[PDB]
Amino acid sequence: LSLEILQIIKESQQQHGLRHGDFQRYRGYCSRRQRRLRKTLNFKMGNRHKFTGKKVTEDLLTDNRYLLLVLMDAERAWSYAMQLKQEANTEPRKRFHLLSRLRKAVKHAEELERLCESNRVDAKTKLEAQAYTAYLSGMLRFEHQEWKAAIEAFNKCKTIYEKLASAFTEEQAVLYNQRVEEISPNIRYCAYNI
RNA sequence: UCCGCACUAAGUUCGGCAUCAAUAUGGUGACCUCCCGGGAGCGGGGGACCACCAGGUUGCCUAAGGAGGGGUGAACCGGCCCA
């Protein structure tokens, strides 16, 4: 139904090491959270000695929790990419795996976006996921030095964030304004690089 | 505050399975094919295909696929230096 992806990710990253710049602990926590969610809802991927490719269909979205699985997959991919960003200063080889991982991060984001097109999901989650996917696509295109698509995605995501902030009270719009302030320097730097 | 309770929500600890590919250059090891010379052992030069290591741009790649570290390397079947 209705979910607050931004609130969940903000409450998760600010309390699991990322508040001071720690990515190993956040990645470990995300992996443990994914494992616990898989065990809790009986979402086993492969049995003993065998593996089967699972899929999140619209029929099983009635639990209002399978969104968190794909969200945590995307968050883990993003954390891995930003972790390799730190170690890419002295290891030039890490960049290829960094980009190969963020390319799958955008795939996870677009999967979580496309699974929300059904009527079982309210209008808030769809718009929030669209903003998240736009931000992720912009980050991906910026990291590959593609400026036009990155700035287009950044414009879309900031427009959605501003509309969402205007839709609510000023007490709760602070987080959306913070996200806008976080993404503005990237847009300005990309424009300056041109 | 007590519960052999129910599920949701985070961590301790121990096992099992699996852990990618293309492109440019150079190198090693098998095998194949063109030559020049020589009274032998052979010497010099050019290519086709496979495996691997280091290492630069990448992906119609996955739930992921480190350019990580170690050991065995066997019966004579990885070669090197070979009494």
Swiss-Prot record:
Phosphoserine PTM positions: S184
Subcellular location: Cytoplasm; Nucleus, Nucleolus; Endoplasmic reticulum
Region (RNA-binding): 1-177
Function: Component of the signal recognition particle (SRP) complex, a ribonucleoprotein complex that mediates the cotranslational targeting of secretory and membrane proteins to the endoplasmic reticulum (ER). The SRP complex interacts with the signal sequence in nascent secretory and membrane proteins and directs them to the membrane of the ER. The SRP complex targets the ribosome-nascent chain complex to the SRP receptor (SR), which is anchored in the ER, where SR compaction and GTPase rearrangement drive cotranslational protein translocation into the ER.
This protein's domain notes: The N-terminus is required for RNA-binding.
UniProt record similarity statement: Belongs to the SRP68 family.
Subunit structure: Heterodimer with SRP72. SRP68/SRP72 heterodimer formation is stabilized by the presence of 7SL RNA. Component of a signal recognition particle complex that consists of a 7SL RNA molecule of 300 nucleotides and six protein subunits: SRP72, SRP68, SRP54, SRP19, SRP14 and SRP9. Within the SRP complex, interacts (via C-terminus) with SRP72.
Protein name, as recorded: Signal recognition particle subunit SRP68
Organism expressing this protein natively: Canis lupus familiaris
Taxonomic lineage: Eukaryota, Metazoa, Chordata, Craniata, Vertebrata
Whole-protein residues included: 55 to 248 of 622
